[PDB]
Amino acid sequence: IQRTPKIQVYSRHPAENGKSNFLNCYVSGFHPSDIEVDLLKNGERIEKVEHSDLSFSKDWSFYLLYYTEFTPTEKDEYACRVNHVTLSQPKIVKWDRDM
Amino acid sequence: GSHSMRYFFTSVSRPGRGEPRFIAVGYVDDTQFVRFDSDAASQRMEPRAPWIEQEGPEYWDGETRKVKAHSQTHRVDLGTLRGYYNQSEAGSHTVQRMYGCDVGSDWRFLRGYHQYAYDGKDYIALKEDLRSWTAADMAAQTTKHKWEAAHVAEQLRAYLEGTCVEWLRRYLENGKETLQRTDAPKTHMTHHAVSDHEATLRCWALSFYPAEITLTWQRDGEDQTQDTELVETRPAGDGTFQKWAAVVVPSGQEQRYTCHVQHEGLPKPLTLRWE
Amino acid sequence: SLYNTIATL
């Protein structure tokens, strides 16, 4: 069977302009495991992104955490781009400081 | 005060060229301590937690040898399953396995498990009694008959009740500084005006461990589920977790709502209310 | 610590 991914974009610590932090894109509940995940800065792909080791839940669906060190500003925009077999087109979730 | 140890294994066939992708991770409660990735350069079981780096060479050589034997069994299984289901060799398929043991508050064996899945669905699992099997379909039925005659359950029961419990307790002591410590959630509430007459109250739970937690909203001392939103618990990335719950309320009536936080790291539940 | 033996499907 196939399962579409749930997506959450957020920072590790409370966002504060000028202060180093970490940007996370958490994808879960999907199947199969092959998935493409990219973090974006003003529409452009970030190179220094890493992710956790593939693991799964009780229902067998997978989850992965993608992250990168960053420094938020009042202007720069951030978002997570996810593509999967269950998706007609790449899905993009913009980062929201209050979420 | 219960604890557990679990191992997760995933194998994905690649018909185009080569062997299946194999990834294995080990966990103690919600802390990952080891991993193996067939795509990595080391080709060895590797440490993912500081407290496991205490084990000597014989440990790592032994774990590496076993995880490799594990990947080879999965490689064979993918082929066997492809036949059981009469499927083409052109498509990629997935086999997953999870096993482990739990110790109760008395630190004695509580329960063990060994489950298997093909393409994201239950295939065969070892029952709680650790003597009988649960087969989802007729492909799994053939597997079950073969494992009964070979007495696979008995062999597993010996590991799950013995070796598994013994090593879980050893890891718990070696990494007691973190593994036997609970991190109470750090809470606060935010307020956002959505209109001239409505506002959203968001209750935050940050940097807590273990992941298990319950957040609930009440209005005038009574549980409320309508007009609320609860996100799934997520990893902070530093070993802890995060969660929040939000409710839409009439501007000026914020004081009627209370957020209730339950977590084992808290002597008694927390109650937050907006200023 | 991983299990030593593992039977096939």
CA A9, CA A6: separation in Å to the nearest integer?
A: 10
> A32 in contact with B at a CB cutoff of 8 Å?
yes
User: Do A63 and A56 contact (CB within 8 A), yes or no?
Assistant: yes
- Name the residue type at position A25: C
Q: Which CATH architecture has domain A1-99?
A: Sandwich (2.60)
DSSP designation for B161: I
In A, which residues are within 8 Å of B96 by CB distance? Answer: 56, 60
In B, which residues are within 8 Å of C7 by CB distance? Answer: 73, 147, 150, 152
Kind of pairing between the strands at B3-12 and A91-94 = unpaired
> A19 in contact with B at a CB cutoff of 8 Å?
no
Only one residue has tokens 């990595």, namely B40
Residue contact B25–A55, C-beta within 8 A: yes
SS3 B145: helix
How many CB atoms sit inside 10 A of residue B182's CB?
11
CA B169, CA B274: separation in Å to the nearest integer?
A: 43
Paired strand residues for B28: B5, B31
Cβ-Cβ contacts under 8 Å for B164 (sequence gap 6 or more): B5, B100, B101, B112, C1, C3
Expressed in Å, this structure's resolution amounts to 2.2
Which has the closest alpha carbon to B12: A31, A72, A79, A39?
Answer: A31
Interhelix angle B57-84/B138-149, rounded to 10 degrees, is 130
> A15 in contact with B at a CB cutoff of 8 Å?
no
Which has the closest alpha carbon to A7: A57, A65, A54, A46?
Answer: A65
Structure tokens at A89: 């087109």
Residue contact C9–B152, C-beta within 8 A: no
Structure tokens at B65: 């040898």
SS3 B138: helix
Which has the closest alpha carbon to B153: B118, B125, B123?
Answer: B125
CA B204, CA B186: separation in Å to the nearest integer?
A: 8
CA B110, CA C6: separation in Å to the nearest integer?
A: 23
Can you point out the beta strands (E) in chain B?
3-12, 21-28, 31-37, 46-47, 94-103, 109-118, 121-126, 133-135, 186-193, 198-208, 214-219, 222-223, 228-230, 234-235, 241-250, 257-262, 270-273
- Mind telling me how many Å the CA of B186 is from chain A's nearest CA? 12
CA A16, CA A71: separation in Å to the nearest integer?
A: 8
CA B272, CA B204: separation in Å to the nearest integer?
A: 10
Residue contact B120–A34, C-beta within 8 A: no
Residue A53: which of B35, B117, B192 has the nearest Cβ? B35
Q: Which CATH fold topology does B182-270 show?
A: Immunoglobulin-like (2.60.40)
> B121 in contact with A at a CB cutoff of 8 Å?
yes
Q: Let me know how many helices (H) and strands (E) chain A has, helices first.
A: 0, 9
Residue contact B117–A2, C-beta within 8 A: no
Element holding B255 (H helix, E strand): none
Question: If phi over 0 gives left and psi between -120 and 50 gives alpha, with beta otherwise, what is residue A71?
Answer: beta
Element holding A51 (H helix, E strand): strand A50-51
Which has the closest alpha carbon to B103: B170, B9, B8?
Answer: B170
> B229 in contact with A at a CB cutoff of 8 Å?
no
Which has the closest alpha carbon to B11: B96, B133, B72, B87?
Answer: B96
Residue of B73, B144, B167 to mutate, interface with C, max C Cβ within 10 Å:
B73
- Mind telling me how many Å the CA of A99 is from chain B's nearest CA? 8
DSSP string, B30-86: TEEEEEEETTSSS-S-EE-SGGGTTS-HHHHHHHHHHHHHHHHHHHHHHHHHHHHTT
Residue of A55, A61, A66, A85 to mutate, interface with B, max B Cβ within 10 Å:
A55
Chain breaks in chain B (C to N over 2.5 A) after: none
Element holding A29 (H helix, E strand): strand A21-30
A53-92 residues touching B, CB cutoff 8 A: 53-56, 60-62, 65, 67
User: Do B32 and B45 contact (CB within 8 A), yes or no?
Assistant: no
**For chain B, what are the domain ranges?**
1-181, 182-270
B35, exposed or middle or buried, with CB in 10 Å at 0-12, 13-18, 19+?
buried
Cβ-Cβ contacts under 8 Å for B149 (sequence gap 6 or more): none
CA B128, CA B134: separation in Å to the nearest integer?
A: 10
CA B244, CA B204: separation in Å to the nearest integer?
A: 5
In C, which residues are within 8 Å of B147 by CB distance? Answer: 7
Q: Which CATH fold topology does B1-181 show?
A: 3.30.500
